Design a protein around this nucleic acid. Structure first.
Ligand code: MG
Ligand code: MG
Ligand code: MG
Ligand code: MG
Ligand code: MG
Ligand code: MG
Ligand code: MG
Ligand code: MG
Ligand code: MG
Ligand code: MG
Ligand code: MG
Ligand code: MG
Ligand code: MG
Ligand code: MG
Ligand code: MG
Ligand code: MG
Ligand code: MG
Ligand code: MG
Ligand code: MG
Ligand code: MG
Ligand code: MG
Ligand code: MG
Ligand code: MG
Ligand code: MG
Ligand code: MG
Ligand code: MG
Ligand code: MG
Ligand code: MG
Ligand code: MG
Ligand code: MG
Ligand code: MG
Ligand code: MG
Ligand code: MG
Ligand code: MG
Ligand code: MG
Lengths: 143, 199, 63, 117
RNA sequence: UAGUGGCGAGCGAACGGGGAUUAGCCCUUAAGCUUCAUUGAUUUUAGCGGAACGCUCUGGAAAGUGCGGCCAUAGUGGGUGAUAGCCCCGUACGCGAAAGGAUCUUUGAAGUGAAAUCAAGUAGGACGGAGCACGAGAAACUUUGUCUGAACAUGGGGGGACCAUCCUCCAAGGCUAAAUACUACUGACUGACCGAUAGUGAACCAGUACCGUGAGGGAAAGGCGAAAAGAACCCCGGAGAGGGGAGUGAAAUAGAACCUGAAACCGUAUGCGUACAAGCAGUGGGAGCCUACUUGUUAGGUGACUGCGUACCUUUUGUAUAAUGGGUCAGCGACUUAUAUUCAGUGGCAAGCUUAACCGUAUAGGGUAGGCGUAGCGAAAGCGAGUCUUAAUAGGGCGU
């Protein structure tokens, strides 16, 4: 019945309107207060502005550069090696599934749980702990 | 199970039919469908499109009247509306998994409340409205929703002029009409169609 | 996206998963005054204070 | 959906102008004066529910006092005379016996004198 | 986001992915595009036919109350004396052109594209400026105002100062549909749009009246009834204006300045109180009189007398204030929307959740590109349940 159903208690609220009456609580000012900047149309203090003291983001030094070398990096957890088909974890095989982005060339494998099955990594270079898991739990690490 | 009128059970999947009736979900699914059909065509007019009203009607001081700046202001008589609204869309995003759980929740209470009549096959022969009226007199129904696998050209030309009888498809049904009409009439071709569509 | 960050605070504040890093200050261009106990206690990379989190996380558009 | 507010404003004006009838001049017929004289006439009706209880208590006392001097006491020695014993009769139903039932009042006064207080 | 930027306010790419659309031809002379001659298709400027109902009540008048029946590829259209699938016009459907109008296409013709001939005052260079996301900056590249100047495919110029090695293209001559942007004007629809202070400035003879030397500004203005049946005739009046009858009508307190007809404002009757009494004009007690009563330990209206009592809003440490504002009434008149993001409430699936454009028999379904997660530390390379600093594997920071 469309004459019956309604939502859960608390799921909908009713958008309090400032500027109506005196019993509603928000009458005659709307929760703003009295005279000043944050009481007027467009009383927006600029984000980061302090009042005239030298702000934080103009007192501290600039401290680095950005590596364009690591715009091509990704990494795969050991637990996600069971999420591919064919048991040949190539470079394009991880792009066949949605486990990795496009335009990604160099991939590692680190230790983040149990592997799951018997695969053959090639084209990708695992860490010290991941290589001690795959070569021990029935896999093979070739190129 | 779903007792077809030719007296044979069918043993449907018990995840679609016979489920818990969450109605916070169904209320949200019928609001998003019913609001998504509204075309939004308003146009009021702000103080910048009302024709004229460029210059001050008198000086700043010395006149006695209150400080006015233009004629086409929201306080004045011929002025413009102060929060005039351009046309816009009304469309909520409902998830694909969330649209389907409202279907598996309203297709359970139609089974409990016995609004659902499953038939062997429903087929008319010539497009003529008085032939279909006599066909629905066999089942004893009135103001019914006809859900079938494919809307036949003979069946679609009938029940356009007919008053309270509507004909749909499984991929043309919606969470309003399954709640709206008095009785829902499905065929055995269509109850299998809700298996791969819902679960 | 209609939310542009500030370019200065993206160079003064790198973000890790334990807050916001920032380099210390006062260490440039007059250094023969200061004491070695004071120089090496400004060499590290600290993390931001709780009074300053909700100020910077509005300058950086994280709100 | 434009709403015009000319039919629910009128019902609230007639509800004010009904409480404010019987008043002098423009207090009973124009609205921007008759709203002040309904709020003010509601504050007075709140204060004077307390002052009602003070204007009869000051009237009961001044009738016992006149009635008990005619028999040979004061008011203040009568109340100490009744509370040597426990006659336990309040001011509302002594100032009734002072006017109407005058012979029963004299039979009370003699017992306060017999109470020697 | 990388960059850019008094490195301030800010401005902001590309590479790579996903879609819509699908043609490349010539300087040996081409597709293509024009303009006529042509043969068919497609609609377009007017139309035509177009299903099915009776009795009975109340009413001024039946579409309504009743009791039945029929039509349907036509059942929520309009309007007829009140609410009509079946009374009228229409609708679903079917057919329609002397003659023009185009749109695709027929196969011819006249052209044209078209500059002649693979590109010289051209590339590059030097000061001065612009455009590149790029405010002389290690400033590449495209442009042109002044001044100059080459190699001739064993050449050339690109790959963000510069140089060697590799890769990739042929500059100084041209032509090209489609996806695309827009609406002064048309037609068909549709509305959680307006309903005469709204909606166009304009429902009314509106860019009019009026205001200006001019450019220019710019209003107010809807409604009798189903049908004029719009008042023959009589009496007062200036032979008028206006009334009093009489007649029409369901109804003239529907009579043309006409549906309903409120508030401020002004009156006329009836009841009760006031001409020896001082003030935000009310409130608590209260005599008497009046009306209806159910005859008054009821109701209504006046209120002699008497106690307490210096309006409302806004600004302020503070207002009866000789501080602000308001002549009263009736209409309108002030926290909204869109796109991004954070926190709570309530929901879906869950180490996984979800798609944007765009397709679609179009609120379904497809589309997982992309995003946020499942692991951090470091300025970085890098290494990873650890990592950075350090001679230290010593401590310590951050993390599980
Ligand atoms: Mg408050
Ligand atoms: Mg303030
Ligand atoms: Mg104020
Ligand atoms: Mg202040
Ligand atoms: Mg992906
Ligand atoms: Mg303007
Ligand atoms: Mg101007
Ligand atoms: Mg307007
Ligand atoms: Mg979808
Ligand atoms: Mg230094
Ligand atoms: Mg006809
Ligand atoms: Mg007809
Ligand atoms: Mg109709
Ligand atoms: Mg009528
Ligand atoms: Mg009709
Ligand atoms: Mg008839
Ligand atoms: Mg060339
Ligand atoms: Mg040059
Ligand atoms: Mg060049
Ligand atoms: Mg170069
Ligand atoms: Mg290079
Ligand atoms: Mg108007
Ligand atoms: Mg009106
Ligand atoms: Mg008559
Ligand atoms: Mg009347
Ligand atoms: Mg009338
Ligand atoms: Mg009038
Ligand atoms: Mg009418
Ligand atoms: Mg009238
Ligand atoms: Mg008078
Ligand atoms: Mg006086
Ligand atoms: Mg006095
Ligand atoms: Mg204050
Ligand atoms: Mg004053
Ligand atoms: Mg004034």
């Amino acid at each position: 019945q469309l004459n019956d159903l309604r939502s859960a208690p608390g799921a909908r609220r009713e958008k309090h309107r400032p500027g109506r009456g005196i019993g509603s609580g928000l009458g005659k000012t709307g929760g703003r207060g009295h005279k000043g900047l944050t009481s007027r149309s467009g009383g927006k203090v600029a984000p980061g502005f302090e009042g005239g003291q030298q702000p934080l983001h103009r007192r501290l030094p600039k401290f680095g550069f950005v590596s364009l070398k690591a715009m091509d990096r990704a990494e795969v957890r050991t637990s996600e090696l069971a999420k591919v088909e064919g048991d040949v974890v190539s470079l394009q095989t991880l792009k066949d599934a949605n486990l990795i982005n496009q335009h990604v060339q160099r991939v590692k494998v680190m230790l983040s749980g149990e592997v799951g099955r018997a695969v053959t990594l090639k084209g990708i270079a695992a860490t010290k702990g991941a290589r001690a898991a795959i070569e021990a739990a029935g896999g093979k690490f070739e190129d | 199970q779903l007792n077809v009128n030719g007296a044979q059970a069918i043993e449907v999947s018990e995840r679609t039919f016979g489920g818990e009736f969450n109605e916070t979900l169904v209320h949200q699914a019928v609001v998003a469908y019913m609001a998504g059909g509204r075309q939004g065509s308003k146009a009021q007019k702000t103080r910048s499109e009302v024709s004229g009203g460029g210059k001050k009607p008198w000086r700043q001081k010395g006149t006695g009247r209150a400080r006015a700046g233009t004629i086409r202001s929201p306080i004045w008589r011929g002025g413009g509306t102060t929060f005039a609204a351009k046309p816009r869309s009304h469309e909520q995003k409902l998830n694909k998994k969330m649209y389907r759980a409202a279907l598996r929740s309203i297709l359970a209470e139609l089974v409990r409340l016995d609004r659902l009549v499953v038939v062997a096959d429903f087929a008319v022969d010539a497009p003529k409205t008085k032939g279909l009226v006599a066909k629905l007199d066999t089942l004893g129904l009135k103001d019914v929703l006809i859900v079938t696998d494919g809307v036949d050209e003979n069946l679609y030309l009938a029940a356009r002029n007919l008053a309270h009888v509507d004909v749909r498809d499984v991929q043309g049904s919606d969470p309003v009409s399954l709640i709206a009409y008095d009785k829902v009439l499905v065929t055995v071709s269509a109850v299998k169609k809700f298996e791969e569509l819902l679960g | 996206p209609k939310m542009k960050t500030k370019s200065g605070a993206a160079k003064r504040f790198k973000k890790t998963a334990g807050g916001l890093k920032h380099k210390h200050a006062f260490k440039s261009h007059i250094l023969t005054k200061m004491t070695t106990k004071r120089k090496r206690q400004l060499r590290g990379t600290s993390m931001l204070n709780k009074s300053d989190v909700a100020r910077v996380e509005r300058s950086l558009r994280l709100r | 959906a434009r709403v015009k507010r000319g039919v629910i404003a009128r019902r609230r004006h007639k509800k004010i102008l009904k409480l404010a009838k019987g008043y002098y001049g423009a207090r009973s017929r124009v609205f921007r004066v008759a709203k002040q004289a309904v709020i003010k006439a509601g504050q007075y009706a709140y204060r004077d529910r307390r002052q009602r209880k003070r204007q009869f208590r000051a009237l009961w006392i001044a009738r016992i006092n006149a009635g008990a001097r005619q028999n040979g006491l004061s008011y203040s020695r009568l109340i100490a005379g009744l509370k040597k014993a426990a006659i336990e009769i309040d001011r509302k139903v002594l100032a009734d016996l002072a006017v109407n039932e005058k012979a029963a009042f004299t039979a009370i006064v003699e017992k306060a004198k017999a109470s020697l207080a």
